[PDB]
Design a protein around this motif. Sequence first.
Motif, PDB file in Angstrom:
ATOM      1  N   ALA A 134       0.814  -1.215   0.000  1.00  0.00           N
ATOM      2  CA  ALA A 134       0.000   0.000   0.000  1.00  0.00           C
ATOM      3  C   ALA A 134       0.857   1.279   0.000  1.00  0.00           C
ATOM      4  N   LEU A 135       1.865   1.418   0.902  1.00  0.00           N
ATOM      5  CA  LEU A 135       2.728   2.597   0.918  1.00  0.00           C
ATOM      6  C   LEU A 135       3.460   2.666  -0.417  1.00  0.00           C
ATOM      7  N   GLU A 136       4.086   1.570  -0.820  1.00  0.00           N
ATOM      8  CA  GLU A 136       4.802   1.523  -2.065  1.00  0.00           C
ATOM      9  C   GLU A 136       4.026   2.026  -3.270  1.00  0.00           C
ATOM     10  N   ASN A 137       2.796   1.548  -3.458  1.00  0.00           N
ATOM     11  CA  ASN A 137       1.987   1.876  -4.613  1.00  0.00           C
ATOM     12  C   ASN A 137       1.537   3.309  -4.572  1.00  0.00           C
ATOM     13  N   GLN A 138       1.213   3.776  -3.382  1.00  0.00           N
ATOM     14  CA  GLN A 138       0.797   5.140  -3.223  1.00  0.00           C
ATOM     15  C   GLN A 138       1.936   6.037  -3.668  1.00  0.00           C
ATOM     16  N   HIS A 139       3.148   5.666  -3.276  1.00  0.00           N
ATOM     17  CA  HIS A 139       4.309   6.447  -3.615  1.00  0.00           C
ATOM     18  C   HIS A 139       4.605   6.337  -5.109  1.00  0.00           C
ATOM     19  N   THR A 140       4.477   5.151  -5.734  1.00  0.00           N
ATOM     20  CA  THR A 140       4.720   5.019  -7.165  1.00  0.00           C
ATOM     21  C   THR A 140       3.722   5.871  -7.951  1.00  0.00           C
ATOM     22  N   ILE A 141       2.452   5.954  -7.560  1.00  0.00           N
ATOM     23  CA  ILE A 141       1.588   6.868  -8.261  1.00  0.00           C
ATOM     24  C   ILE A 141       2.021   8.309  -8.033  1.00  0.00           C
ATOM     25  N   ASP A 142       2.485   8.779  -6.858  1.00  0.00           N
ATOM     26  CA  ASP A 142       2.858  10.191  -6.741  1.00  0.00           C
ATOM     27  C   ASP A 142       4.161  10.526  -7.392  1.00  0.00           C
ATOM     28  N   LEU A 143       5.081   9.601  -7.404  1.00  0.00           N
ATOM     29  CA  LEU A 143       6.366   9.755  -8.067  1.00  0.00           C
ATOM     30  C   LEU A 143       6.242   9.956  -9.580  1.00  0.00           C
ATOM     31  N   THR A 144       5.435   9.121 -10.252  1.00  0.00           N
ATOM     32  CA  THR A 144       5.214   9.262 -11.685  1.00  0.00           C
ATOM     33  C   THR A 144       4.414  10.525 -11.981  1.00  0.00           C
TER      34      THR A 144
END
Lengths: 175, 175, 175, 328, 328, 328
Positions: C101-111
Amino acid sequence: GLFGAIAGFIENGWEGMIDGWYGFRHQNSEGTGQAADLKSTQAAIDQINGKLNRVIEKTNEKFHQIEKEFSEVEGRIQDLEKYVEDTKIDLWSYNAELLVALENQHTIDLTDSEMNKLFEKTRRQLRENAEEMGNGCFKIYHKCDNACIESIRNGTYDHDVYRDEALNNRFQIKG
Amino acid sequence: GLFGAIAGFIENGWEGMIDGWYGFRHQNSEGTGQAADLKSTQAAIDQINGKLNRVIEKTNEKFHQIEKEFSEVEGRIQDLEKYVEDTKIDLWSYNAELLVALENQHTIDLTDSEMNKLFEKTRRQLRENAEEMGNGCFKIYHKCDNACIESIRNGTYDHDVYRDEALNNRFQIKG
Amino acid sequence: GLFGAIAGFIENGWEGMIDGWYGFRHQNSEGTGQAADLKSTQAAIDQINGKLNRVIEKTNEKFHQIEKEFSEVEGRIQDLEKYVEDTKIDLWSYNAELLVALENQHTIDLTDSEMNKLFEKTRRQLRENAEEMGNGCFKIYHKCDNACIESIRNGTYDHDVYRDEALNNRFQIKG
Amino acid sequence: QDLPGNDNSTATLCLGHHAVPNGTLVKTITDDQIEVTNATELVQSSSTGKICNNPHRILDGIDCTLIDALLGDPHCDVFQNETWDLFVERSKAFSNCYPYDVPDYASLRSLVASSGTLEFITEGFTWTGVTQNGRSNACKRGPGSGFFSRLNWLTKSGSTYPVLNVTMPNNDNFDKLYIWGIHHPSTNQEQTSLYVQASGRVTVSTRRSQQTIIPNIGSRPWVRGLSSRISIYWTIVKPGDVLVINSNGNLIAPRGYFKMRTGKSSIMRSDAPIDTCISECITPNGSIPNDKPFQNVNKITYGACPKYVKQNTLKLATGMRNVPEKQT
Amino acid sequence: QDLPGNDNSTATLCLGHHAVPNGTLVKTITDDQIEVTNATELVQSSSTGKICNNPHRILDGIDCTLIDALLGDPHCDVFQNETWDLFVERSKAFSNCYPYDVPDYASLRSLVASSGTLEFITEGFTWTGVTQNGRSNACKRGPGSGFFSRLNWLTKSGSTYPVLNVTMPNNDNFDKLYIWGIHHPSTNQEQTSLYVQASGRVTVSTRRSQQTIIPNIGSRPWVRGLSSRISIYWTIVKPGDVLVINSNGNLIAPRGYFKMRTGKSSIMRSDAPIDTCISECITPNGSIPNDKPFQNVNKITYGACPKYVKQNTLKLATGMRNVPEKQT
Amino acid sequence: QDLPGNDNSTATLCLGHHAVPNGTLVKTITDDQIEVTNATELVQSSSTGKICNNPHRILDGIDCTLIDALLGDPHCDVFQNETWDLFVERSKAFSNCYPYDVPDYASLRSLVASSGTLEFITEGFTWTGVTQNGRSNACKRGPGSGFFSRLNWLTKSGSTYPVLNVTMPNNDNFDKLYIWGIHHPSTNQEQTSLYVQASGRVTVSTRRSQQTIIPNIGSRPWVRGLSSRISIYWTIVKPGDVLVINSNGNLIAPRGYFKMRTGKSSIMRSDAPIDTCISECITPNGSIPNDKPFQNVNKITYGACPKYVKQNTLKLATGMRNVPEKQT
Ligand SMILES: *[C@@H]1O[C@H](CO)[C@@H](O[C@@H]2O[C@H](CO)[C@@H](O[C@@H]3O[C@H](CO)[C@@H](O)[C@H](O)[C@@H]3O)[C@H](O)[C@H]2NC(C)=O)[C@H](O)[C@H]1NC(C)=O
Ligand SMILES: *[C@@H]1O[C@H](CO)[C@@H](O[C@@H]2O[C@H](CO)[C@@H](O[C@@H]3O[C@H](CO)[C@@H](O)[C@H](O)[C@@H]3O)[C@H](O)[C@H]2NC(C)=O)[C@H](O)[C@H]1NC(C)=O
Ligand SMILES: *[C@@H]1O[C@H](CO)[C@@H](O[C@@H]2O[C@H](CO)[C@@H](O[C@@H]3O[C@H](CO)[C@@H](O)[C@H](O)[C@@H]3O)[C@H](O)[C@H]2NC(C)=O)[C@H](O)[C@H]1NC(C)=O
Ligand SMILES: CO[C@]1(C(=O)O)C[C@H](O)[C@@H](NC(C)=O)[C@H]([C@H](O)[C@H](O)CO)O1
Ligand SMILES: CO[C@]1(C(=O)O)C[C@H](O)[C@@H](NC(C)=O)[C@H]([C@H](O)[C@H](O)CO)O1
Ligand SMILES: CO[C@]1(C(=O)O)C[C@H](O)[C@@H](NC(C)=O)[C@H]([C@H](O)[C@H](O)CO)O1
Ligand SMILES: *[C@@H]1O[C@H](CO)[C@@H](O)[C@H](O)[C@H]1NC(C)=O
Ligand SMILES: *[C@@H]1O[C@H](CO)[C@@H](O)[C@H](O)[C@H]1NC(C)=O
Ligand SMILES: *[C@@H]1O[C@H](CO)[C@@H](O)[C@H](O)[C@H]1NC(C)=O
Ligand SMILES: *[C@@H]1O[C@H](CO)[C@@H](O)[C@H](O)[C@H]1NC(C)=O
Ligand SMILES: *[C@@H]1O[C@H](CO)[C@@H](O)[C@H](O)[C@H]1NC(C)=O
Ligand SMILES: *[C@@H]1O[C@H](CO)[C@@H](O)[C@H](O)[C@H]1NC(C)=O
Ligand SMILES: *[C@@H]1O[C@H](CO)[C@@H](O)[C@H](O)[C@H]1NC(C)=O
Ligand SMILES: *[C@@H]1O[C@H](CO)[C@@H](O)[C@H](O)[C@H]1NC(C)=O
Ligand SMILES: *[C@@H]1O[C@H](CO)[C@@H](O)[C@H](O)[C@H]1NC(C)=O
Ligand SMILES: *[C@@H]1O[C@H](CO)[C@@H](O)[C@H](O)[C@H]1NC(C)=O
Ligand SMILES: *[C@@H]1O[C@H](CO)[C@@H](O)[C@H](O)[C@H]1NC(C)=O
Ligand SMILES: *[C@@H]1O[C@H](CO)[C@@H](O)[C@H](O)[C@H]1NC(C)=O
């Protein structure tokens, strides 16, 4: 927070805005008026609810487990029973403490973000006809009555309609 | 990091700035100058300390626990004593490794954020009198002596005072 | 996500861009074209791979452990053997669920971030010669042939070369 | 366009966000009190004080512990063949029959507690050569002496106690739990009076296991008029196996088997009142609502419950930072 | 407004951030070495090498283990009635009295270790018909033979060892720990010489429990001149209960009780030197500072200590990314 | 400066990002299904169904359990002196020798399983006065009767069974595991026929420990023609210590020692086929690949394996949000 709109370039909130989380106050030809923005209000609310629901997703159930209170002194095995539970509780307590800290930190930056996104969105729309006064307000350099303010708010404002009036007012002046 | 100021549009740091974390270098009618910005320096430092203190908040204490080193071979119960501890250590090691990774990632985006906020703040203040050279420097289109540079820095710069001089210099020229 | 470029001011993606993750589409007096931007594409990809590799870093190995399936009913000690493992599995399952969950949230904000950084970078470069149409496109106010579009893309565009042509076209008009 | 659009005025539009006069402090990665518009509590910290009798089957043990209900202490005869999802044991429970001790009390209490049934089937054991149904005045059943309803105390017939050697096959398709015991006399005289042989012996076995216990003569403290004791043991017999009970004195024989099952049953020590309400999560302090993710009421729980945590409050921010415009 | 500014020039203002020549590498969600301005270590990885004798009460066991200090091995008589927050046991400790074994040594060492006291109260047991105070040359007290100070070896008087049946009520309001034992002779001749009866028996009980141990004759390996052994057992007597010791031979009788308490005491095996300094966290490797959150010195700790972790270094970035301007 | 010459026009440049027609749903802090361009699975959920015989040394137990291979059941003589990284025990394994029970079966199976070797050294015990090599028709070795290869059943010689008192020093520099036992006769007649004394006794000791077991006469269920049983016990002898076996009847004597080691060995119950392939992670369901971080195949594993998790799928987004032109 990360974007520096809330508690940042926007000095403080409006205790008077009761109809939404983010919004517009204006002062124009017909006077002053306020209005909540419902799209960013909904965007902030949906994200926080989504986050909330994930946290309340399924209490798992447990039935026969181990004893956790003892009345006699037994030594080796009861010491282990106590140690398994005490290290279980500290690990779950660590988890709860870290989870609400990450969560809250993110809820403050997320709502900061939506404020800033609404600002940028309005900036983009006014194009060459307004300037940013730097405190979350735009100075609109053309006559903009209450229907004009309503078109900025409901996102139908056409900058072209006022571009020459605005560019004149804005630049020309005497320098 | 997320904002792309540090190690981003600002090409590199200044090893020479020893009086603060963020700051200004200018060139004007009166010469060149450097100066740290203490408000953003304090904002970054307070956040990192806050983060730090939360991490050093209370070592919990433990007294009688279970044996963790054994000299004879016993089988079933000692195998359990060893398994309880080994799974406790791997769970705490996972926690420590993930905590400093999230923490550090955030510390790099937070300091990126403060750089970018200081930039935006200065941008906003110079209004129509400067342009962004895109490398973290503004080209101020009017005569701005040391006291003028000091007013931008201490946040009292009045753009109106130079607006016509600036707009002339900036636009008019020959096109 | 946090920056509001992807699924934000940029209405939707291009299923037709097959040569990179981020990129450009143009229309000038010589035609229309598309081209991926490889620097931001590589920046997004490297970060996601870095993240990925950290997640697949070392499966630890375990040899003799405790029994985890039993055929007779024994009581106190077997109840403990079962409880140690069941609380181990729920703690590791919580960890895996929170990590992605943290990882994916961050991958969407990073891109989201990289898209917005590429936009800002292009904005900065065009200087006073273009305006933001608010939907991720700039209106370039001067004649810009395919080599001019290529120089914006490969980052060698000189705004000065077109500044008076652009400023004329952009402002003067009739207001 | 128009013609000379001359009206040179301007407008001001300001964006802002709400604020509330009140506001809640929450913890953060960087701050441990920062004030937000609104927050929600994540730790359940209070019980109703009553164990809801629904949805799980609560069996109130009243003044019986589960082991006395199993053995069949006269005063717990109410519980024969009873069943439960959660057996509540009360602090007031008392034993009131022949003084006994159970070598691994803790496992037998567990093992019965999660089987969840006290269903007893009587089997036709034939004890030839001994006097059956021995009873004691420390285990009064009604006006008379008595003994545990589920146990059968064998003593000599006339002048002899033979070597008993009985067998009972598990021909059903389920496991059978047999509870049996051994009597420890106070004096060698008591031993010979009751069992003739000056040294008893009990061996209970299956194809898989065997237990041989020999009694131990000696005075223990007076409990309900007696210095003797009986110790309780158990044997599970798997389908297809066979029980063989072989003794030469001191056997407290089984009268049949309890049947075993596999379920979600357990036992709980609690003096909380049972009450009619539905609640999934039970705590020795009474039921609690499992709407929150964590709870601080008690580390002992049964059912769908919040995870126990040391913290008694954890607030999740459900709103933006509160930056009031004065504060009224 | 103002008049002709003859000159009209421009200025340049640049924003930037510091950088340092040095800089530290830290791990991140996306990178595992990224260089930052400054970082702080979170894993404590070194001990002083000395157990500070403050604030906890360290009792150095010198060449006594806690069980020998409990039993009263002559050479450990220094520890009578002693107390501790942490008893340190040394690798050099040795036993030097009648060869004994303790069936669940591990629980008795635990149970005493966290009680934290060796306070012994002598009680007036009356052993009628036996010879008290038996001693042995493998447990020399001074020039003479001796035995454990806290135990009392009974042998026959003249030609008889009676059936001892004594009782001692717990009338105080605290739990009483009784340590007692049984002597296993090497030969049947030794058995009859000492205890007359060719088969001893010890039964120690309360209202709640009972232990009957019977001795086992046979040769064990020569230890301090002997092939016999004594095995040590323990019984806790709760307030209001009563101890009954009943034996017919081989009893190693208690001389009173140790009193039990509830505290933060524990025991630690360590050869680290005790030294004068204050330190909250003790490790078998010596004290360590609990200023950091995690430690890698040892998984065994006592006191307020950092959480043990497998990693030996974890750096928390306390500064921005270091982007210096010179080459390398 | 630059001179336009003639043309007056504008251009449009638009920035955008890709999108895919397909796309994967992933969970997030704020959403539990949000669609991204691409994702990667983190939970391994399938086994090959075969235990790869490489890199660990798999020993297939075929129809022997490890304890029968240890004891030396005739049909498991294949495993003498065998070694393993993982011993696989099959559900079909059966015992086929003298009916025995092992008091803490679970620890002896563990203790041997991780030692990893069945290396047996025969030692020259001299049993004077008894008949050696007793065998039974329930443990057929070839056409004849037989017994466990690693055990030695002693019975009387002529009209006497003496008190055996033997010793065997551990003079090597490693620990020695001795497996020994006691025979429980069905009848007192059987007892006296075989061992003369009407009550046997076995005491096995070292300087550190002692076990005395006394046999228990009585009928157990017929297993391979017999109602008697033998119970198995074990003693580890440390370097420099000494074993003393002292018995007066019923001893099933050791023939030497197994040597012990310390390694990464363990045992696994599995009916999965062994096959030739290399795989680091073994599951009772067959090997699985440890390329992913978590697995959902089985909580029982040996080797370098993914962490078991309750979830059967966890997708890690490896791309941006998918915002297609048309639909999904
Ligand atoms: C072995 O020693 C114990 C302890 O001295 C003896 O136990 C005591 O025995 C007497 C006589 O049976 C018990 O007396 C009865 O007590 C109840 C309550 O006070 C009272 O109602 C009766 O009238 C009578 O006084 C006494 O309670 C009992 N005490 C304990 C702690 O068990 C035991 O009798 C001795 N046995 C032999 C064979 O010598
Ligand atoms: C049963 O067998 C054991 C083992 O053979 C016998 O033990 C041994 O007994 C002898 C004679 O008592 C011991 O001799 C002693 O040696 C020490 C030096 O190590 C010396 O200082 C003493 O004066 C004495 O000579 C020997 O050590 C002892 N060995 C062991 C391993 O215990 C035992 O005596 C036999 N018992 C019977 C009743 O047959
Ligand atoms: C004590 O009671 C048990 C149970 O009644 C007796 O066990 C039974 O003994 C008989 C006679 O030895 C066994 O019969 C044999 O069974 C095999 C298999 O059917 C068959 O090949 C033989 O021809 C014979 O029928 C029977 O299986 C056995 N049953 C059990 C459950 O063990 C035991 O003999 C009694 N012992 C004494 C000393 O009274
Ligand atoms: C003290 O008198 C009684 C009793 O308990 O009331 C009488 C009772 O009929 C008798 N029952 C039997 C089967 O013998 C019992 C035992 O002799 C005694 O419990 C042995 O411990 O003793
Ligand atoms: C070997 O001689 C001694 C000894 O130990 O020094 C002499 C000692 O006075 C005697 N003490 C008593 C109470 O009997 C003791 C026991 O007989 C022996 O330990 C039984 O194991 O034997
Ligand atoms: C039933 O006959 C046998 C058997 O097992 O085949 C014959 C066998 O030679 C004999 N072996 C010895 C050493 O005595 C054995 C024991 O008497 C019996 O197992 C005691 O339990 O009995
Ligand atoms: C926006 O506001 C103007 C003025 O009220 C109105 O005419 C227009 O229809 C509005 N559009 C929408 C979508 O509400
Ligand atoms: C800002 O700088 C100008 C020039 O030094 C000075 O006059 C003014 O007072 C300064 N204001 C503050 C708040 O420092
Ligand atoms: C950028 O594009 C122009 C036009 O194609 C070209 O002349 C120039 O060399 C390019 N620069 C780079 C670095 O590719
Ligand atoms: C505060 O948050 C909770 C959970 O989102 C919600 O139920 C409650 O209504 C909120 N309070 C207000 C005043 O909106
Ligand atoms: C208990 O249930 C069994 C099975 O139906 C029955 O045969 C038996 O008589 C019951 N006894 C009582 C007391 O309910
Ligand atoms: C719950 O019960 C325990 C033990 O009975 C008590 O210590 C605790 O404080 C109680 N908590 C609540 C919320 O009732
Ligand atoms: C590095 O960080 C630690 C913790 O914040 C601090 O004590 C130290 O002084 C910092 N180093 C420098 C050079 O600022
Ligand atoms: C131990 O303390 C008790 C209680 O005060 C006392 O009676 C006893 O004599 C003390 N003995 C020694 C050796 O200190
Ligand atoms: C601490 O002690 C253990 C065991 O004595 C040793 O293996 C370890 O390396 C030591 N570590 C330190 C930091 O002294
Ligand atoms: C999806 O992500 C995985 C891991 O990054 C990668 O191997 C795979 O090729 C990606 N899919 C596509 C179509 O790029
Ligand atoms: C087992 O190995 C030992 C040690 O080399 C050897 O002496 C013994 O004879 C071997 N026995 C068998 C059956 O392999
Ligand atoms: C693995 O085996 C267990 C027990 O044999 C079974 O319940 C489980 O479903 C199996 N899973 C897979 C992926 O084979």
